[PDB]
């Protein structure tokens, strides 16, 4: 369809490909929604091939693509208002990923990213996360927002809020974390979990629709692997790193105490004292302003200095009077 | 709380003052108690507001600009609360669409071979089809 309708073959083909760029994007997300566990290899061959095509279109038709991207963000928001998580699907997770491929995420303001980043952060805060599927959906979202900020490294409070409850969800309370509000107390891991076997931390998207302990542990390890990355990249720079990490130290401390063999919290933990040791936590000083100079006003003057008509009329009468009086005398 | 002048460095300060300043930095500890229930005993006035500094790096451009006000001189007498109170995630998205200033959509020169990880470059390691 691209080849048959290149811009040169006929007039109007730029607009036709411009609309086809939007139509292609709706196809990429549409296929992901459709069930594909039977032929994952075949789906993986088509889905990435279409994305590679979509990237070429964006270089020429980003404006048409941008408009479709912003409309979809409105559509996800509208469906979320009525159905909440039931509206959300695998297509949305794929969609948020494609935007990162095709658009510059590391911008303070962007037409498509900023609505996406607000919408994504809404899910990390508003959604209940009362099921393993729902937590796995959130675990993907943390990875996307983390990749959006892979250079900017901006602070997303929702990621802090998300990590706290998910870590506390799998320990259910211990009676020591009353400030964290959980949405499901029946997802706690059993004490018999090994935490020594090699369990894959990758979350395949087709598994979410199917969504026991092994899946719970694999989701948990993925969340903590994101937590380790966030600490070492983003939070360490912030002046409030100690305040940001303090609740998480207690949660990771619980994991080590409850599961001695489990090593991931200890590696995240041991890293954390190392950061807090080096970092100097001095009072901030922000109101130090440069001295303001005395004002500067330009001079008023004439370029060619000279040391209405009714006044001029009166002026000429005075001279004419003086001549007349001398003439008369 | 927004700034302690004793911790500022002056280029004219003598070497002894530099040494004295360094020791003061090493011994500082935040005295704010988060568990104390009496607001008159929390020692907050002796603490500092690091948390508002971090908000200057908030991902939302307009929230970051608001947070930056604490770094600017306090010229304004007050802020109208009613203009900031009743905001929602929906309002932020709607406000984003009805933006007075319209910008051009940019693109990423960096190229990733695959969007998702397997079960060269992967955009989302840890996620698979």
């Amino acid at each position: 369809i691209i080849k048959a309708y290149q811009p040169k073959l006929a007039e109007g083909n730029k607009e036709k490909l411009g609309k086809f760029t939007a139509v292609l994007l709706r196809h990429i997300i549409f296929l992901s929604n459709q069930n594909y566990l039977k032929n994952v290899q075949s789906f993986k061959r088509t889905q990435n091939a279409l994305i590679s095509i979509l990237k070429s279109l964006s270089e020429k038709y980003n404006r048409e693509l941008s408009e479709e991207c912003r409309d979809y963000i409105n559509e996800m928001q509208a469906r979320y208002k009525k159905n909440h998580f039931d509206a959300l699907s695998n297509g949305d997770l794929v969609f948020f990923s494609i935007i990162g491929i095709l658009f510059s995420t590391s911008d303070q303001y962007h037409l498509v990213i900023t609505p996406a980043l607000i919408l994504m952060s809404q899910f990390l805060e508003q959604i209940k996360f009362n099921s393993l599927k729902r937590i796995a959906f959130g675990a993907v979202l943390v990875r996307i927002v983390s990749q959006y900020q892979r250079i900017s490294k901006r602070y997303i409070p929702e990621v802090v809020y998300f990590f706290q409850k998910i870590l506390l969800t799998f320990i259910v309370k211990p009676l020591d974390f009353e400030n964290i509000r959980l949405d499901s107390y029946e997802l706690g891991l059993p004490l018999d979990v090994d935490f020594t076997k090699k369990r894959s931390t990758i979350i395949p998207l087709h598994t979410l629709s199917t969504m026991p302990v092994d899946q719970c542990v694999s989701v948990l390890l993925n969340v903590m692997e994101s937590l380790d990355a966030t600490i070492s990249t983003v939070w360490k720079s912030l002046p409030a790193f100690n305040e940001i990490i303090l609740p998480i130290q207690q949660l990771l401390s619980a994991y080590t105490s409850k599961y001695s063999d489990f090593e991931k919290p200890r590696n995240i933990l041991n890293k954390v004292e190392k950061l807090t040791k080096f970092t100097e936590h001095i009072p901030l000083a922000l109101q130090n302003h440069k001295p303001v100079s005395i004002p500067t006003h330009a001079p008023k003057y004439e370029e060619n200095f000279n040391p209405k008509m009714k006044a001029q009329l009166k002026k000429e009468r005075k001279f004419t009077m003086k001549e007349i009086r001398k003439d008369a005398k | 709380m927004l700034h302690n002048p004793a911790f500022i460095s002056n280029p004219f300060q003598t070497p002894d003052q530099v040494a004295n300043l360094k020791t003061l930095k090493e011994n500082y500890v935040d005295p704010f108690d988060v568990h104390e229930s009496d607001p008159e005993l929390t020692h907050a006035l002796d603490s500092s507001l690091w948390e508002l500094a971090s908000l200057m790096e908030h991902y939302h451009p307009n929230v970051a600009t608001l947070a930056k006000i604490f770094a600017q001189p306090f010229k304004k007498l007050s802020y109208n609360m009613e203009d900031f109170l009743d905001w929602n995630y929906d309002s932020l998205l709607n406000a984003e669409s009805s933006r007075k200033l319209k910008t051009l959509p940019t693109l990423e020169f960096e190229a990733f071979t695959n969007v998702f990880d397997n079960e060269g470059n992967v955009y989302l390691p840890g996620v698979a089809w």
């Binding site: 911008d107 303001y109 | 970051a64 200033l101 051009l104």
Partner: peptide, 30 residues
């Protein structure tokens, strides 16, 4: 050039080259 533009946009350069502070006029009021 592309690297420099990305750094400029990262720091608030908005291409129509305005700034992020410009977008913050009338945002909170309405």
């Amino acid at each position: 050039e592309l690297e420099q533009q990305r750094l400029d946009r990262m720091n608030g350069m908005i291409e129509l080259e305005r700034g992020v502070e410009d977008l913050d006029d009338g945002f909170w009021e309405n």
